[PDB]
Scaffold this motif. Sequence first.
Motif, PDB file in Angstrom:
ATOM      1  N   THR A 298     -14.750 -42.462  44.686  1.00  0.00           N
ATOM      2  CA  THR A 298     -15.467 -41.158  44.410  1.00  0.00           C
ATOM      3  C   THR A 298     -15.273 -39.573  44.721  1.00  0.00           C
ATOM      4  O   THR A 298     -15.139 -38.389  44.414  1.00  0.00           O
ATOM      5  CB  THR A 298     -17.184 -40.979  43.764  1.00  0.00           C
ATOM      6  OG1 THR A 298     -16.867 -42.277  43.445  1.00  0.00           O
ATOM      7  CG2 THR A 298     -17.396 -39.634  42.953  1.00  0.00           C
TER       8      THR A 298
ATOM      9  N   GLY B 118     -21.537 -44.602  46.568  1.00  0.00           N
ATOM     10  CA  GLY B 118     -21.891 -45.684  45.657  1.00  0.00           C
ATOM     11  C   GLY B 118     -22.062 -47.465  47.260  1.00  0.00           C
ATOM     12  O   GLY B 118     -22.836 -48.219  46.619  1.00  0.00           O
ATOM     13  N   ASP B 239     -28.251 -51.088  39.638  1.00  0.00           N
ATOM     14  CA  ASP B 239     -27.131 -50.353  39.748  1.00  0.00           C
ATOM     15  C   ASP B 239     -26.726 -48.686  38.674  1.00  0.00           C
ATOM     16  O   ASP B 239     -26.906 -48.983  38.066  1.00  0.00           O
ATOM     17  CB  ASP B 239     -25.691 -50.458  40.270  1.00  0.00           C
ATOM     18  CG  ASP B 239     -24.513 -49.370  41.092  1.00  0.00           C
ATOM     19  OD1 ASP B 239     -24.723 -48.664  40.651  1.00  0.00           O
ATOM     20  OD2 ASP B 239     -23.769 -50.236  41.514  1.00  0.00           O
ATOM     21  N   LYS B 268     -24.140 -40.513  43.393  1.00  0.00           N
ATOM     22  CA  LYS B 268     -22.932 -40.139  42.685  1.00  0.00           C
ATOM     23  C   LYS B 268     -23.880 -38.040  42.324  1.00  0.00           C
ATOM     24  O   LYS B 268     -23.950 -37.725  43.149  1.00  0.00           O
ATOM     25  CB  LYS B 268     -22.407 -40.373  41.392  1.00  0.00           C
ATOM     26  CG  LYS B 268     -21.482 -41.319  41.480  1.00  0.00           C
ATOM     27  CD  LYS B 268     -20.525 -41.642  39.924  1.00  0.00           C
ATOM     28  CE  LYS B 268     -19.671 -42.394  40.188  1.00  0.00           C
ATOM     29  NZ  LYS B 268     -19.683 -43.632  40.805  1.00  0.00           N
TER      30      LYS B 268
HETATM   31  C1  LIG Z   1     -19.057 -44.814  41.148  1.00  0.00           C
HETATM   32  C2  LIG Z   1     -19.216 -45.620  41.537  1.00  0.00           C
HETATM   33  C3  LIG Z   1     -20.436 -47.011  42.662  1.00  0.00           C
HETATM   34  C4  LIG Z   1     -19.247 -46.868  43.686  1.00  0.00           C
HETATM   35  O1  LIG Z   1     -19.765 -45.341  44.192  1.00  0.00           O
HETATM   36  P1  LIG Z   1     -17.968 -45.090  45.412  1.00  0.00           P
HETATM   37  O2  LIG Z   1     -19.507 -43.035  46.003  1.00  0.00           O
HETATM   38  O3  LIG Z   1     -18.431 -43.957  44.707  1.00  0.00           O
HETATM   39  O4  LIG Z   1     -18.498 -45.301  46.624  1.00  0.00           O
HETATM   40  C5  LIG Z   1     -21.328 -47.505  42.472  1.00  0.00           C
HETATM   41  N1  LIG Z   1     -21.419 -48.402  41.594  1.00  0.00           N
HETATM   42  C6  LIG Z   1     -21.403 -47.368  39.659  1.00  0.00           C
HETATM   43  C7  LIG Z   1     -21.888 -47.860  38.220  1.00  0.00           C
HETATM   44  C8  LIG Z   1     -20.736 -46.481  39.968  1.00  0.00           C
HETATM   45  O5  LIG Z   1     -20.143 -46.065  38.465  1.00  0.00           O
END
Ligand SMILES: *Cc1c(COP(=O)(O)O)cnc(C)c1O
Lengths: 422, 421
Positions: A298, B118, B239, B268
């Motif tokens: 992301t 994430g 999550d 996020k």
């Molecule tokens: C985007 C996302 C992640 C990963 O997060 P990053 O910061 O991109 O590593 C994990 N879980 C869900 C549900 C996501 O949408």
Amino acid sequence: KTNIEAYRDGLKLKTEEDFFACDRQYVCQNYAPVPVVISKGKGARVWDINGNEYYDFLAGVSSLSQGHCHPRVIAALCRQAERLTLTLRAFGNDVTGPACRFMAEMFGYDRVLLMNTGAEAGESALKIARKWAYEVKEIPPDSAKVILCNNNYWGRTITACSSSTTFDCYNNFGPFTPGFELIDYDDVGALEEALKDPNVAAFFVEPIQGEGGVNVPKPGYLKRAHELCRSKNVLLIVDEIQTGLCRTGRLLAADHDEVHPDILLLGKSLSAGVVPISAVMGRADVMDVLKPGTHGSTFGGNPLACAVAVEALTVLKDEKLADRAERLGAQFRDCLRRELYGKVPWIKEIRGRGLLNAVEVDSDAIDPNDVVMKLKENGILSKPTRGRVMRFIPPLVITDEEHRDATTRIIKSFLAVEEERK
Amino acid sequence: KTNIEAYRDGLKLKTEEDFFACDRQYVCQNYAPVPVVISKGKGARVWDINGNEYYDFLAGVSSLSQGHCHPRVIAALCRQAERLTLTLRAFGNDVTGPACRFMAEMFGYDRVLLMNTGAEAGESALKIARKWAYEVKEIPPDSAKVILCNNNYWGRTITACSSSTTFDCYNNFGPFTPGFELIDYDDVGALEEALKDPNVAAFFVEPIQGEGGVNVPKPGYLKRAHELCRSKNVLLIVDEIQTGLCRTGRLLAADHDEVHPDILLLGKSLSAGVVPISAVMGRADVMDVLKPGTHGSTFGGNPLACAVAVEALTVLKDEKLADRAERLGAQFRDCLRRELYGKVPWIKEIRGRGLLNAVEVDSDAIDPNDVVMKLKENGILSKPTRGRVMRFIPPLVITDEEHRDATTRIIKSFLAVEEER
Ligand SMILES: *Cc1c(COP(=O)(O)O)cnc(C)c1O
Ligand SMILES: *Cc1c(COP(=O)(O)O)cnc(C)c1O
């Protein structure tokens, strides 16, 4: 005025113990911190909540080489943050490309992959090396091996835990990712034997072991390792997340051996400690195995971090921080050896390159934590690794006078603990 | 002029094409980006290098719920950045503890672990679950299993690839981390069978699958799953990195089912898209298995990101963005359904909760990318998932006037592509 400030005011935290208790109650208890509550940083100095000043001799384990709150880095953060912070790599923007070009040209690589943390950089390099081994070397599916060294540190993902030899790092976190062969660090004969396996994709190594205790290898180690790897068409992945960016007196610690890593990793001071940004760089025919959809992140390559990284990298060059680390580091080691060796028998070794330095003590002969408390009592903040390896990793911007003062305080702390032993 | 600005000026990049060529030459080519070159963002809007305006309907895949460059968030960043940005968790500071208390109280958990991405939050949760299973459930050494669902997404680490069923995520990145059992999403019976294995540590699930296609499960799914996990002393790891923080019209998407996750993941929009910060939260007897030295991160919980996160989280509350997401998202789905079902035959389904919406198309009856380009012609920036799933994920701060305008523009784009068919 801001929400964190106002929330904090409302909690009425006055004393250092008010903060320690807040931390104990609400923060996951996976660190044992030094009892200090830092509220401001500038250059080589930090202040606690009571106005007491210290020299920061950990510097984010070499994440703050440019000093705390470097005005240029902060100005570049704040200018870019007013404009645009995040698009994703799903959309183009006017920063990411140029910043990757800046890094590509500075370090001499075809392609730059931007990630967020050092652990993400290591993960991404291992994935690159495996996919390359499968598609270019054409080794059998699922059989790729990566050679790493005992006491390596590259982070805290399950795959890093799976390739670690440190008990606390892996214990009760399995089952583990397969595909790793561990050999001794600083041992060329063991590497050469491990390279007999044609399933090896890569050898993944630190020019100096950081978390493992500032372990400096023998002259020629990396040069010799690289030749062995090339002769077997095996990628040399060099982790410069702690050693790189002027900390050892050169732009990359690999430069000491004239080694250009097949895959280079950077992080930590890549941002001057302002935001997490890491990099994986390599030649086109290696890096290009990561086709669209096969890898992502992301925040990786977000325009804010990119702006900060280019500023942070420029400060390294403009302020000649490589020359500064070379010069001050040699002096630090010279001082400590002169005034401590002999007079302090429980010092096992003083070692380092540039301003990545350590004093290993004999933890049977002394409580290592007495040295830490004493150092703090004398205005020096550090945190050991492995209990007994005292670390001295100041920002590279430390002035001549600050460094002289700090060195004096550091010497005095060891002597004081030695006197106290009597 | 800062170093990036002066360097970029020196490159003499004038057109969009000059920027795309710069990307192809120097940037690892692990994305296939849409051809736009964004220069600035404000709220629900962005502008390209030629001053063309667009609505951002990806919003960092729900990382920009507060909008681009939220002034309060940027002011928080800048004020804190002048004082202190990193100490490590090796030293105390005057920010991390208070920010974690803020979070603990807002989400109702005993302990907060702050990480950066994430993926790292997911890794950290899997570590905690495994260690807790070994130490508290006393399951045998290396025997911990974690259940997750087909089409899940939680990141790009090797261990995430090892637990993916998406070919491009895992292919040629092995050998893989063992200990995962994949079941169908939105399938309570499959969960119940999988929970028979007493070596299960956790079920790891999204309240709505994000990258998987905005897959909204049947009524009661999460509620029923939590009860089955409790029956067997298995941790429910939810999550909410994509679904949380008001996106689905509730603070947490889990709230739709009145489920309090045993371990919660945020990321996020936790930072309003400004810096990467993620969180793992849980009860004390679970989270305290992470003893000193057993887990860490250089930037995890740094004071700058903490100050940002707290401001980001206060915006969500202050601006009533859950209510905004509920109200606008319903209006969005209703308008699209009313003007598009029956009139556009290649739309398989219009779905979502709050402002996490999707329009899945049948790609044997239409080119997915034709839709994406017409959206872009019409000032709407989006990126599908799985080719055929169009996503409509605007910032939650999108005004009433802006949202009506965007809704018209998206309706017009689907109808124009049907006309052209
Ligand atoms: C985007 C996302 C992640 C990963 O997060 P990053 O910061 O991109 O590593 C994990 N879980 C869900 C549900 C996501 O949408
Ligand atoms: C600190 C460190 C890492 C990991 O970086 P994080 O940003 O903490 O994940 C990797 N490699 C080395 C050599 C390090 O010192």
